[PDB]
Design an enzyme around this catalytic site. Structure first.
Site, PDB file in Angstrom:
ATOM      1  N   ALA A 136     -11.069   3.269   5.476  1.00  0.00           N
ATOM      2  CA  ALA A 136     -10.289   2.328   4.688  1.00  0.00           C
ATOM      3  C   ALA A 136      -9.466   3.054   3.630  1.00  0.00           C
ATOM      4  O   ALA A 136      -9.602   4.263   3.414  1.00  0.00           O
ATOM      5  CB  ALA A 136     -11.204   1.302   4.015  1.00  0.00           C
ATOM      6  N   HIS A 137      -8.613   2.288   2.950  1.00  0.00           N
ATOM      7  CA  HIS A 137      -7.722   2.870   1.962  1.00  0.00           C
ATOM      8  C   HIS A 137      -8.516   3.517   0.839  1.00  0.00           C
ATOM      9  O   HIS A 137      -9.549   2.996   0.399  1.00  0.00           O
ATOM     10  CB  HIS A 137      -6.762   1.815   1.398  1.00  0.00           C
ATOM     11  CG  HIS A 137      -7.438   0.609   0.816  1.00  0.00           C
ATOM     12  ND1 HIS A 137      -6.739  -0.372   0.145  1.00  0.00           N
ATOM     13  CD2 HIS A 137      -8.735   0.220   0.806  1.00  0.00           C
ATOM     14  CE1 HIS A 137      -7.578  -1.311  -0.258  1.00  0.00           C
ATOM     15  NE2 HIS A 137      -8.795  -0.978   0.136  1.00  0.00           N
ATOM     16  N   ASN A 138      -8.046   4.692   0.415  1.00  0.00           N
ATOM     17  CA  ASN A 138      -8.574   5.417  -0.730  1.00  0.00           C
ATOM     18  C   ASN A 138      -9.975   5.950  -0.489  1.00  0.00           C
ATOM     19  O   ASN A 138     -10.686   6.294  -1.429  1.00  0.00           O
ATOM     20  CB  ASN A 138      -8.522   4.542  -1.984  1.00  0.00           C
ATOM     21  CG  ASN A 138      -7.102   4.217  -2.367  1.00  0.00           C
ATOM     22  OD1 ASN A 138      -6.610   3.114  -2.134  1.00  0.00           O
ATOM     23  ND2 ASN A 138      -6.408   5.208  -2.904  1.00  0.00           N
ATOM     24  N   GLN A 165       0.870  -1.166   0.000  1.00  0.00           N
ATOM     25  CA  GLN A 165       0.000   0.000   0.000  1.00  0.00           C
ATOM     26  C   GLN A 165       0.911   1.220   0.000  1.00  0.00           C
ATOM     27  O   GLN A 165       1.348   1.686   1.054  1.00  0.00           O
ATOM     28  CB  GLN A 165      -0.935  -0.062   1.201  1.00  0.00           C
ATOM     29  CG  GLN A 165      -1.774  -1.347   1.194  1.00  0.00           C
ATOM     30  CD  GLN A 165      -2.919  -1.278   0.192  1.00  0.00           C
ATOM     31  OE1 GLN A 165      -3.827  -0.466   0.344  1.00  0.00           O
ATOM     32  NE2 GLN A 165      -2.874  -2.117  -0.841  1.00  0.00           N
TER      33      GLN A 165
END
Ligand SMILES: CC1(C)CC(=O)c2c(nc3nn(-c4ccccc4)c(O)c3c2-c2cccs2)C1
Ligand SMILES: CC1(C)CC(=O)c2c(nc3nn(-c4ccccc4)c(O)c3c2-c2cccs2)C1
Ligand SMILES: CCOc1ccccc1-n1nnc(S(=O)(=O)c2ccc(C)cc2)c1N
Ligand SMILES: [Mg+2]
Ligand SMILES: [Mg+2]
EC number: 2.3.1.191
Lengths: 335, 337, 339
Positions: A236-238, A195
């Site tokens: 969460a991511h993004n 990531q």
């Protein structure tokens, strides 16, 4: 401590009473004593102001006839309360000066009047702006940048390559920049996707305790300006959160969710990913958000509490609602 | 530490049947127990299985005794006796011993007798630690907070300023006590922080799990009663009051200014609205959606449980369109009558 | 980290079309990629867009190759190849390097070769760190715990005592492994603590997210199988057993003594009750409310999704009164049956 007339001036409030009264702090209406200022928003309290022992009460013009003490008249007592609590704030700082037990990489850049708490750990390449305060035991990872005026309480973790703007505040136990939950699959075996995106936090962002905000997979997780996020949240991511959006405690967000500006996400809601929520959406508590939200307004889900005896029957009938629907169709045909 | 079975039975107020000189070294499950272990039987269906148990002694009831194939300790409550004897034989280490040279302790902190503070803990000015308090490694204890005698913090616990913790508490790692409540006023769409200048008051014999957060009050205090047990990853918002002996299982999220009475049991993953009250002796089962106040004791529940996805799709769609079903039913009632 | 495109292609078992001497410095998204970056295409909708991508190379399929406007790496699975090439080109730093002077390490701890321990980490007596283990800044590792070769803890991870972690695990910050389970007897309303003297056993190749908690067992052990991945904010109670390669998404709560099988997929914010078993190859969609054992593989779901608040108010009222609707339906059926 501050003279009431001075406090009123700073609050842009119309004073009705003795301006020489010395105000030492804020208190609730039920607890206030001599020297405290308090506030009222609900008219129910008008009748018993004779029992309130505050030196001054913030109220509206319509409340003024009922006053039994010096009063500050304003249009919005709750907002004025926030302002005067900041003036009279007693909260200490997470740290003062640079602790000799802190471990600060020689390449870290510190601005003016930066304070770093005991046993905090500052990695190589980190940049701390003027007036930044890092609490005891924090970790700030490589090349991360924290803008002027921002403050971390004790035991906050910032990973690497994170950008935080000015005048932010992060409560203890929170983790910013951990790996997103990204994996490919090779014959049932999970394959980690590094990531390598980041987290970008804007200005004036307030984040509660034990909240996690993951770094993006390639591009970035983005928290807009003026966002407030409560405890125990997962971003969460993004994920992308628009300016001034508020996220209450225990909310879980999935990856690549985009939330607009001026949203209100109720506590313990669950928001699925790869979708957008437009500006000015309110999701009430425990909301199960499965679909994009394209229109502003208030949205809700869930079947609330009943006595257990009743719930047993409610749940059984709902689970068999297809049979009910078929029985209703059959009855309609026969009639 | 090892103990003679007779001495153990005396501390447990148990009737010994067998060799009082047997040396017990620890507690074990019935299936894992080996020589030197004591175990316990709560389910009489295992009476026929006692011959397969290799423990040196077994805690059981008087009705079980004829079925024993070992030294037996006869008690009225084998489960409670299990708890007591596991405490006596506890192998859990302490979070710290002595005061670590790497701890950072303000000169104005007041340490009682026999206090232990772990490596790299940080103790602020004005902190008071009572006798026999133990602070784990990496903890932070903020200004003027007070921790009563016998209370213990595992590693990496954060206590903010002006917090009060009573005696004989236990706080697991990652927990944060006294962070700002979620207090903001709105000004033309912008959030304005309301400083949270209340405190947290935690009573005696309170146990708090890992990564739980208990926020300080806005003006008045967040209050945790005596004997309360709280599981992992709960959020206890500003100005919540929890009455004595209440249990809160894991993952419960409470809004602010909720009052919970004494002897409640809040099931895991429940969600509780604020500015309202739950009376004494209320049970909320797991994942309870508590939107409204609870005025009568008893058991309350919510939620539609799992179905095969194919089934669930129809259930969800039919429920979302239940008003249409309702209207069709009413129309059919009028047509028939 | 820079690598020649031909060598990257060889390491990816990819067919190179274009200049093998191109130097690749990193991975980037298609929209962000610049000179020196390699990217990937999984959606053929972007074929007409490749002329707008500034990557030096693009991973794609054989069917995509005629649409390339750059060096191309042809592979069967661009997404899997992306994962592999992101690892080869990973810019993620290590949690620590060497042994920090500020770390506090008990004299009885046993370290393998090439171990790193970050600043102000605390290592208790009897701990064993295998070869290549990395302990991030500010961690705590409790007495007699064992961390196998290649495993890494980010900063501010807490491991209690008697915990066993396998090889090549990764644990993100704020996570707590081995705290007491929620065990208490009850003496007339007073809770009596049950010491939790079981352990946590974590297998090989386990990845755990941030601020996740995994409690130790009461007597027997909490067990996390090999190859399990667990997201942020999860709660794994005492004596839970999770089978190999199962995936647990963020915010999942599991109650005590739950057994989950292999190759399960547990969606975010699900709630799984305890003293029951879920068989292999079960998918629970997000927010699932799991109250009963699951004995067959397949996909299971619960929950009534969002509606406009005014609509939800009516739905909720009708559902809460569904028993009256049932009785009216039965009454109407009886009338139509002429009874
Ligand atoms: C304190 C005690 C000794 C007794 C007890 O009452 C209790 C205990 N452990 C629990 N785990 N979970 C749980 C955890 C996570 C997800 C779902 C459920 C409950 O709901 C639990 C409850 C309760 C049941 C009903 C009300 S409280 C142990
Ligand atoms: C492990 C993987 C590579 C693939 C995967 O299966 C998965 C992934 N990320 C998820 N995030 N959320 C989520 C998180 C927060 C709120 C709501 C949902 C899920 O439910 C996720 C799932 C699953 C879907 C159904 C069962 S597991 C990434
Ligand atoms: C639970 C944490 O909730 C918050 C925390 C901080 C700030 C605002 C909220 N919040 N979010 N939604 C609501 S609610 O009243 O719609 C609600 C609906 C259903 C239920 C069961 C509870 C609450 C509130 N009170
Ligand atoms: Mg130190
Ligand atoms: Mg939750």
């Amino acid at each position: 401590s501050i003279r009431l007339a001075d406090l009123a001036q700073q609050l842009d409030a119309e004073l009705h009473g003795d301006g020489d009264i010395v105000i030492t702090g804020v208190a609730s209406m039920q607890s206030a004593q001599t020297g405290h200022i308090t506030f009222m928003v609900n008219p129910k309290y008008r009748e018993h102001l004779g029992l309130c022992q505050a030196s001054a009460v913030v109220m509206t013009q319509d409340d003024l006839p009922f006053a039994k003490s010096a009063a500050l008249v304003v249009k919005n007592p709750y907002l004025t309360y926030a302002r005067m609590a900041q003036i009279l704030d007693t909260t200490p700082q997470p740290a003062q000066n640079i602790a000799p037990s802190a471990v600060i990489d020689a390449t870290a850049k510190l601005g003016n009047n930066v304070s770093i708490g005991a046993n905090a750990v500052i990695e190589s390449g980190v940049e701390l702006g003027d007036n930044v305060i890092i609490g005891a035991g924090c970790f700030v990872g490589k090349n991360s940048k924290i803008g002027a005026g921002s403050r971390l309480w004790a035991n906050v973790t910032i990973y690497h390559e994170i950008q935080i703007g000015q005048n932010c505040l992060i409560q203890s136990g929170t983790v910013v920049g951990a790996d997103g939950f990204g994996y490919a699959n090779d014959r049932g075996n999970w394959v980690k996707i590094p990531q390598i995106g980041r987290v970008i936090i804007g200005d004036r962002v307030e984040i509660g305790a034990c909240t996690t905000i993951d770094r993006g997979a390639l591009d970035d997780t983005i928290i807009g300006n003026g966002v407030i996020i409560d405890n125990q949240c997962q971003i969460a991511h993004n994920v992308v959160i628009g300016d001034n959006t508020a996220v209450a405690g225990g909310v879980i967000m999935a990856g690549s969710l985009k939330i607009g500006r001026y949203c209100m996400i109720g506590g313990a809601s669950v928001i699925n990913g790869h979708m957008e929520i437009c500006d000015k959406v309110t999701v009430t508590g425990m909301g199960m958000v499965m679909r994009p939200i394209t229109e502003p307004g208030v949205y809700s889900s869930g079947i609330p509490l009943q006595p257990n005896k009743v719930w047993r029957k409610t749940a059984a009938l709902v689970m068999n609602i297809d049979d009910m629907s078929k029985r209703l169709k059959s009855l309609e045909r026969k009639v």
